Ligand binder design. Structure first.
Ligand SMILES: O=C(CN1C[C@H](NC(=O)c2ccc(Cl)s2)[C@@H](F)C1)Nc1ccc(-n2ccccc2=O)cc1F
Ligand SMILES: [Ca+2]
Ligand SMILES: [Cl-]
Ligand SMILES: [Cl-]
Ligand code: NA
Ligand code: NA
Ligand code: NA
Lengths: 42, 234
């Protein structure tokens, strides 16, 4: 159940999903320098 | 934005600003992708023609990373009307793609069912924009952000002179003097879930700004995930 701890998924939920600009490692890993929804660093 | 604070470098990188024929901001938007900006349908009525500025944090200084984009296509929800302010959503397709960089990056679109149970149940979200810093005051020259609590729909309906629809949600404070304001409309409301920010709202309307016993009203992005997906594929 995603009912508890999101099924451990870092993002979408068992089966995990990630938003565009990420791949499923559970965790989600950026595929580029500016993945969605992350504050940018210099 | 009334109250809140300034966005630092990289902190609100999904903010877009719609600029009118005077090169002045009049509404916000949310970067969704290289070619798409999310905004409020009601904003489309409020300029003769407009363009999109990304990467700006100070409208009085030209800073590294600012860029201007023209709009190729406007997709306005057919059901929007000023009679109700319901369906207050539009998507802009840009002529040229945005280059992501410091201060320019998309907000994530959540998946629907997951979003309702997981995002809409969080305590707070973040709203941002270049709007007025007081109800009767001037637009901010600096990009601001504000943490706003999700507000119970029933308390919100009780407080409101107008109908709150299923395509809206309420956020902000009963009496604390912090809220979005004129000029912030169309801009992002994002909710953080485990290190990632997802777009959950579009700044839509309010009875004044930061009024006692009134809240801010946002277009409920989860109500339109399919609509947004279809618009971005058109
Ligand atoms: O017209 C105004 C003018 N306001 C807008 C400005 N406030 C804001 O834009 C916001 C405050 C908080 C948020 Cl979120 S957005 C304020 F400075 C003056 N507010 C408003 C009030 C009610 C509605 N409304 C709501 C439902 C049905 C009809 C209708 O007109 C729309 C509106 F735009
Ligand atoms: Ca600037
Ligand atoms: Cl409704
Ligand atoms: Cl008003
Ligand atoms: Na800060
Ligand atoms: Na809640
Ligand atoms: Na209030």
């Amino acid at each position: 159940l995603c009912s508890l701890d999101n099924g451990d998924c870092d993002q979408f939920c068992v089966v995990c999903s990630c938003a565009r600009g990420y791949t499923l490692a559970k965790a989600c890993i950026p595929t580029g320098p500016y993945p969605c929804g992350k504050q940018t660093l210099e | 934005i009334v109250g809140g604070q300034e966005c630092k470098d990289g902190e609100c990188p999904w903010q877009a600003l719609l600029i009118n024929e005077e090169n002045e901001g009049f509404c916000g938007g949310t970067i969704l992708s290289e070619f798409y900006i999310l905004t409020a349908a009601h904003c489309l009525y409020q300029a003769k023609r407009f363009k999109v500025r990304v990467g700006d944090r100070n409208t009085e200084q030209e800073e590294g990373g600012e860029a201007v984009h023209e709009v190729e296509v406007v997709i306005k929800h057919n059901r929007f009307t000023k009679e109700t302010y319901d369906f207050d959503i539009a998507v802009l397709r840009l002529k040229t793609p945005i280059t992501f960089r410091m201060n320019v990056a998309p907000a994530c679109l959540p998946e629907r069912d997951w979003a309702e149970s997981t995002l809409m149940t969080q305590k707070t979200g973040i709203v941002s924009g270049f709007g007025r810093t007081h109800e009767k005051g001037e637009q901010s020259t600096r990009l601001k952000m504000l943490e706003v609590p999700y507000v119970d729909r029933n308390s919100c309906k009780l407080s409101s002179s107008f109908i709150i629809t299923q395509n809206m949600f309420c956020a902000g404070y009963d009496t604390k003097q912090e809220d979005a304001c004129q000029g912030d409309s169309g801009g992002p409301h994002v909710t953080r879930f485990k290190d990632t920010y997802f777009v959950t709202g579009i700044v839509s309307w309010g009875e004044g700004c930061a009024r006692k016993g009134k809240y801010g009203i946002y277009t409920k992005v989860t109500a339109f995930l399919k609509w947004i997906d279809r618009s971005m594929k058109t």
